[PDB]
C-alpha cells in the first residue's frame, strides 16, 4: 500500500511531502523503540536531489522525536549509506532518494541494522504505524541526539582494500566515469583514481537538477556518453545512476554492455577466487550466469525479481555473489545491496589482471540473444499468467512458476511475467541463437494471445 | 487561539510536536510567499533546550517546502536572532524557545523583517494558514536552500561598538554572570570579558536539561546566586534566562535589584546621552521611570502590558528607550526587542563611568514602594475590572483604563489588572511611602470585593 | 627575487615548504600591521591542489601570529577569492595556488584590499620582511581569530546579477564544461546551470591529483575536449584551468578558439552596452581589439605584458574592459583580475542574445593571422632587444618599445619580446593575411639574427 | 634540552612560536615515518588557550608535510585527547596546552600510540630531528590528509560506562564544578549531569583569556570557590585546571582537600573492587596510600616524581591504580595519564555508594600531617642531596634514594629532593602526629644546613 519493492517513492512536495517524511521517520522510530532497543541509532543519508535536504530534515526530526539517535552522513551513495549503517552498528538506516527517477521525484528507503533493505515483516509494521499514527513520543529528556559523520572516504577505503590495487596501478586503465550528477559524483571518480586509473569524469559535479540528463543510465540516455568513450580512446566507460547503486559499462568501441554480461564477469572472478559457492540470481537473468557457475563449480539459486529478494536470499543461504537482470551486483561480504562502486572496482581489477581489452573480455563469455516486449493488458494479469502456464503445461512445455511463467527449453527459455506497478505483461525470451530467441519470443506472445 | 502574547508555547513532544513545528514553518513560509516575495529569506535560531534541535529541523523542513531560503544560526539568544534577522535583511525570523519555562517546554516565536516580533495581523494570517493547512508547496526546483551562519561574535561586536569600552577597561568591574545554562552562556560572559570586566560565570555551560535550576531568574531561584555574589566580593551580579532576553542584576551586597530600577538607570543614561526623547513603557511600570524622564526632559508613553506592544510603540512613535515592569529594556536603535546582553553592557558602562557602587547607584534613584497580590477569580474578569473602574469613578478616584483599572493618586497609584492567561486578577499598588503603598493596595482589594 | 609576475610559485614540499608558507604569512601580516591597521582582516583561499591544505594551514598560522584576523574561504577559484577579499572589506587576501602548473607545484598569491594582486611596492616590503624575518609577533591576547566562510554561492549569485538570465533561459544553450578537476569544478557548472544552460561537465569533480590532464587548458591538452564537444553536438564548450581564472572556448565544430577572439567578443559586448569607454590591453594582443574599440567609439591603452599590469591600468585609468593575449578578460566593476566564470557568463549571454552559432560569432570578427616562434638565446636579452629596435629604427620601420620591440606596420606588426624567466626571445607577428603575417615574421627573425 | 618532564612549554609567540610548532610537528612526523609506518595517523587537540589555534595549525601543517594523516579533535581535555589517540588507533598524538600555566603560556605534548606521553627514547629522537632539521618531506601525492572528529561525547560516554550510574542517580549528589574556563568546561559539567548529579558550574564557559583566575586550582586560587561551595550548600565541589587532567575536591564545609586524600579514596575503591593489585605512585606520596593498599591486600610501587614515570610503571608492571603527590589519579585501563573527569566520576560514585558526607569520607582515612618548605640553593643540588644522604647514613637513619633523599622512619619520613627546573631544594616531611611532622621537618633542614 505504502512501500513499493524497496522503499516509498513519489513526486517531491506533492506526494513525498515533509509531512510524509516526518510521519515515515516517526513510524520508523516507533518500530525501533518497540523492539527492545532503548536508544536506537539510525544512519540517515540522501542523494544529490534538491528536495532531499528538506525531506531529510523532516525525517530526522521525526526520528529524534521517538528517542532515536541519528547519524547524518550527508550526501552519499545508497550503497555507501547501507555500508555505514553496518559500520556504525546502527539499529536502522534511511536513504532519501528516488534512484533513477526524474529530478521531480524523491523517496525514502528504510534499512536493516546490517544495511540491507527493511524486511517486509517490519515494513508492514512501519506502514501500520504510519497509517494509525500510533507513534512513540519520547519525553523531553529522552529526545534523541543528532551528529554528523563523513562516510565517503571510509567507504572508498573499504572498497579499495577489497581489490588488487597493485595490478590496477601496473595496468593504469583509462576509464571514463559518468556519475550523472548523482551521489556517485563524490565516490566513483575518487575511488577509481585511488585504484590507479586515469580518470576522465563526465557530469561528476553534484547537482540535483540533473542538467545533463535523467539519472537513469540506459542506452538512449548514454548515447552521448558512448560517443565520449569512443572519442577519448578510453579502455572502457562506466555510468552510474543518481544513488550510485548501479553501474553500466561501455567498452572501448562505445558499445552498451548489458548488465548481465558484467554481472557474469564479476561472478566468474568472485567464484574463481572463492573456489565455487552459491550464485543467487533472479529467474529473469540469462543462462550465461548458469554457465559461469558451472565453469566455477558453483550452485545457482534463482529467486523472484527484485534486489531485496536477492539480498535476502544471499543473507539467508550464505551466498557468494548476487545480481539481477539489470546487472546490479551484490557483494554479501561487503554490502547487502547493489553497489555500483564495488562492481566498478571489481571490473577494473578484472580488466587489469586479464591483459585483454574490455570488448575481448565481454565477447569471450558464452553468447546469448535476448528479445523483449511488453503487451499492455489491464486486469488480473496474475490469472492470465497462470492460464498461460497451464496452456504451456498442456502442450508438454517444461515450465517454472517462481515469478511468472518461465518455460524452460533446451538451448534457452521464454518468460511471461507481469509487472505489478503498471498494467503491462512483459515477455522475456532468450536462446543461444538469434533465430531461436525470436522463435521462443513469438511462442510467448502466441500463448499470451490464447489467454 | 494558537499564538500567545509573543509566540506559541507548550510542552515539547506533547503539544509542540514536530508536526506542530512543521505546520508552523509551512504556514510562515506561505505567509512570506503570499506577500509578494519570490524567494523569502528566514533566519532560524533556537536556545539550548534539548527539544530545540528536533523542532528546529521540523520548522526548517517546513520553511524549505514553501520555497523560502533559511539561515540556520544555531544556538543563540533570542535578541541575537532578532539582530541577525535584521542583519541578514531576512524577510522573517523564527526562534525555537520557551523563554523562562521549565525544561519540558518549548515554543516558536515568529519575527518581522526588522527582527521585531510578528504583527498581530500577520499572526492571524499564520493562524489561518496553520488551521486550514492551505500551504504553498514549491516545485522541486523552487525548494528553498539552507545555509548555516554563526552570529555570536558579530552580535557581541555589535554590542561592544555601542558602549564606552575604554571606561570599562579603566574601571575593570568584577561581574558575576549567571546564564542559567541558557543561550546566554555563549554571549554574555564573552561580551563582559571583551568589555574589560573580570568575569566569574555561574552555570555558563550550555545545557538544555538545566541541571542547576529552572531558567527563570527570580529571587527564589537566585537565592544561591546572591550568596555567590556576596561571597565572591564582586561589584555586582547579573542573571539571565534561557533565551537571554532578560537580565536581572544583583548588587555587591547580594540584594535582588528590581527590574524597574535597572530600567530606570539605563533609561536615565540613554536619555541623558540623547538630550531627551520618548520613554515608551507599560502602565504597570513605576513612576520611577516618569521622574527619570522629567529629569531628562523626555516624554513618557504608557502602553498596554506586553513587550511586543512596547516594541511596536517604540517603532511607530520613534521612541528612544523602552521597557516593561519586569525590567526588560528595549533599545530601538539596536534590536526591536528585549536584549539582556545590551542592557548588561549599558549597566556596566554606567557603573564604570559613575565611580560609585552598584547599591549606591540603585539607591540614588527616587524611592518607591510596591506591593503585589493576586485573586483567583473565575468569571468575566474584564467585566469585573470595568465595574471596579466604574466604582472608583463614582468615588471621585482618578482612573486610567489603558490596561485594567489604574487609580491615579498624587504620590502613587493602584492597578487592578486581570491576567489574560490564567483566571487570576492581580492588584498592583505603589506609593512614595511604605504606609501609603499598602493603603492603595487595601483600597484595590476593597474595590475588587465590592465588584465581586 | 622571491615573487614573480603574480605571486611566488614552486614545487610543493621542496621549494614551497610549510616553513616558506608560514614565513610568507608572517611577512604579509607584518606588512598589514605596520600599515596602521590594528586588527587586519585577511581572506585566505586555495585551489584543489593536494598540497594546498598544508600550505594554507601554515600561512594562516603565520597570519594569526601577527595579530591579523583570517577568513578561511576553503577551496574556491582565484577570482572568487579576490571577490571575497573585496566583499568582506578585508585588508588583504591570499590564494594558495599555482594556476596551470602541474600537480607537484603550488604557490601563494597576495592580494590588495580591493582583491587586486599585491602592488610591487608592497611586494618589495613583503620580500624584505620575508628575508630579514623582522616579523611582528602579537601578544597572547592580540593573536588573530580564524573564521570560515563559504563564498561559492554568493560569488555565483554575484555573477548571475550581471548578465541577462532571461535571454539565456529562453535560448537554453548546450555548454560543455572542462573544469580540469580545478577550483572551477565548484562554480562554473553550477553558474551555467543557474544561467539557464544545459550543462554537461567533464572533469568536474575537484581532485588535486588531476587524473585527466595537467590543469593547463591548451590545444594539445584540449584535444580530447574538442572531440567531446564535437560528439555531444553542443553549442560550444568552455575549459578552465586549476584556479579557474582563465576560460578557453571551443565552438560547435570542435575548433580551439583563440583567447584574443573571445576577449574581442566580450569587449565588443561590454563597450556596446557601455557606449564606449577605455579598453586596457597589452602590446602583444591582436589589432582585432583595436577594431572592436573603434567600432564602439572607445579608446585603447596598451600596457606591458602581464595581467597585474592590466588590472593596475584598469584601476588607475578607470578602464571599462581589460584582457591579455592569452584571453584572460578582466571586468573592473566585478573583480580586479582575470575571471573565467564571469567571462563564460558574458559569452553565454552574447551567444543567447545573438541568435547565431558560436563559430559564426567568432568568424564575424575581423580576420587576423598570427604566427609565433621562439629562439633560445643566452645573454643580455634586453640589450639584444634594444639592438633589434635600433636596427629597425635605422631601416625606417616604425617601432614601439613599451615591452620589447614592436614594429608597428600598416596592416599588422611584428613583436620581438624576450621572456624574463626562460632564456628565450619570442617573436610575435600579425597581419591581415597569411602570407604577409609570415613575411613580417621572417623580418623579425632576420633582425634578431642581425643583432645576434 | 627542549622537552621538560612532559612536553615543552613557554610563552606563546615568544618561545612557542608558529615556527617552533611547525618544526615540532615536522620532527614528530619524521619520527613516525622513520619507524616503518607508511601513513601514520596523528590525533591533534588543544585546550581553550587563545594561542592554541595558530599553534595547532602550524603543528598540523608540519605533520601533513611529513606524510602523516591528522585527526583534529578541536578543543578537548588532555586525557580526552589521549583517549582519542588510543581510540582512533593512531600512531601518535599531540596536545597543544600549557596545563596550569598563566594565559600567556602554551606548549605541545607528544603522545604514544596508546595515548601515554611520548617515551624519553623517542623524545630524544624528536629533539635530534628538531635541532638538525633532518625532516622527511613527503612528495606532493604523499602529503597527509586532515579530518576533524568530535571526541567530547564519546569520551563522556566512555567515562559513564565505567561507573555505577544508577547509584549516582539514586543519590543525586549536588556538585559544584569549577572548570576555570579550561578544556574541562566541555566535559565535566555534562559528564556529572549524565551521571545523575545536580550540577552548578563555575567558570564553565571556555575562554582562553581566563577572566576569573589563573587555571591552576590551588587553595589561594580556590579561596572564592570554597566560599561558593559553602554558600550553595552543596555536597562537594570539584575544580579542574586548563587541560582538565587534574581534579581538586572541596568538601561540604569548604575545606580544601589535599590530592593525596582523594587519591587514597579512589585507590581504596578501585583496589576493593579489584581484590588487590599494584598501587604505583611516587616517593613523595604520603603513607596514607600504603595503608590503603595494606587494607586491600595490594602492593605499592614507589617511582620517581613525575606523572609520565607513574604511567610507564603502570603500563610495564600491569598496575591497577596510579597517582602522585598532587593527587592526579591514573586509571591504566581507561587512559594512561591523569584524568580529572574519570577521577571526579569515581569520587562521585564513591560518595553515592557510601551514604556519608564528603568530609566524613575524607576524615575516615588514616590521619597524616605534612609540612613543605623550600630553600633556594644554587649550584649542583644533586651533590648536596647526595651529601645529605651520606650524613643521614652516618647517623644511622634509614634512607631511600629513589628520587632525592627520603629518610624512612617508623611513623613517618622526611624527604629532601631538589627540583631541576629551579635552583630550589624542597624538604618534604610527614608523620602520624602533628609534632613529629615538624620534628622530622627540622631534621631535614638540619641535615641540609650541614651540607
Residue numbers in the entry:
A (entry chain C), D (entry chain D): 3 to 453
B (entry chain B), C (entry chain A): 3 to 454
The publication says:
However, in the hyperthermophilic archaeon Thermococcus kodakarensis, a single gene, Tk1108, encodes a protein with both PGM and PMM activities. Among the remaining three gene products, only that of Tk1108 exhibited both phosphoglucomutase and phosphomannomutase activities; based on its former function, the protein was named PGMTk. Moreover, thermostability studies confirmed a half-life of 85 min at 100 °C.
The map of PGMTk was determined at a nominal resolution of 2.45 Å with D2 symmetry, as shown by the GSFSC plot (FSC = 0.143). The tetrameric structure of PGMTk is constituted of two dimers arranged in D2 symmetry. Alignment of 453 residues of chain A to those of chains B, C, and D using GESAMT resulted in root mean square deviation (RMSD) values of 0.18, 0.18, and 0.17 Å, respectively. Residues 3–138 constitute domain I, residues 156–256 form domain II, residues 261–370 comprise domain III, and residues 384–443 account for domain IV or the C-terminal domain. The first three domains adopt a three-layer α/β/α sandwich architecture, whereas domain IV or the C-terminal domain form a two-layer α/β sandwich topology. In PGMTk, the N- and C-terminal regions adopt a compact, nearly perpendicular orientation, with an interdomain angle of 95.7°. The N-terminal domain was found to have lower B-factors and showed a rigid symmetry, while the flexible C-terminal region had comparatively larger B-factors. The alignment of PGMTk structures predicted by AlphaFold2 and experimentally obtained using cryo-EM showed an RMSD of only 0.41 Å.
